Amino acid sequence: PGGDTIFGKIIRKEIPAKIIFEDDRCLAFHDISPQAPTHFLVIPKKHISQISVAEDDDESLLGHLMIVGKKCAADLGLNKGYRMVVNEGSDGGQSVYHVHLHVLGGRQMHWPPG
């Protein structure tokens, strides 16, 4: 495992998180510093440090994060829409080196996206 980051600790249940969904290969939970009325993360249990190092063999897993994200968004009542975000590296503002998909909604999201 889950990795040497705070997200690994969340996966291993060593620290608390408000979990929305879990299966054998991913976990969705509310972000601790929400930027919208609804703001959660979907992360793989496999420790991929950043999207730039994902491989072709990870394609289904990465798509699974997005499908889980859109299902969770619907379950959380985001019927007016939302935004999905993956941050990579310094310029991307990536805060934890464990791949994570942000899902934000419950307010108008603006443009540019940061």
User: In the numeric block, which tokens belong to residue 6?
Assistant: 């705070």
Which x/- pattern over 28-57 shows residues binding its own copies (rule: CB under 8 A)? Answer: -------xx--------------xx-xxx-
Considering the rule CB under 6 A, would residue 87 count as an interface residue with ligand KAA? yes
Number of residues that bind ligand KAA (CB under 6 A): 12
- With beta carbons less than 8 A apart as the criterion, state whether 47 and 98 touch: yes
Which of ligand KAA, its own copies, none binds 82 (CB below 5-8 Å, type-dependent)? Answer: its own copies
Q: Which one of 22, 25, 93, 107 is in contact with ligand KAA (CB under 6 A)?
A: 93
Positive or negative CA dihedral for 103, 43, 101, 81?
A: negative
Q: Which one of 2, 3, 11, 17 is in contact with ligand KAA (CB under 6 A)?
A: 17
Tokens 């291993």 -> residue: 12
Q: Which one of 12, 19, 23, 32 is in contact with ligand KAA (CB under 6 A)?
A: 32
Instruction: Determine whether the annotation assigns residue 31 to a binding site.
Output: yes
Nearest-5° Cα angle at 73, 94 to 39? 40
Tokens 């496999």 -> residue: 46
Q: What is residue 38's three-state secondary structure?
A: strand
Which amino acid appears at position 48 of this protein? I
Considering the rule CB under 8 A, would residue 77 count as an interface residue with its own copies? no
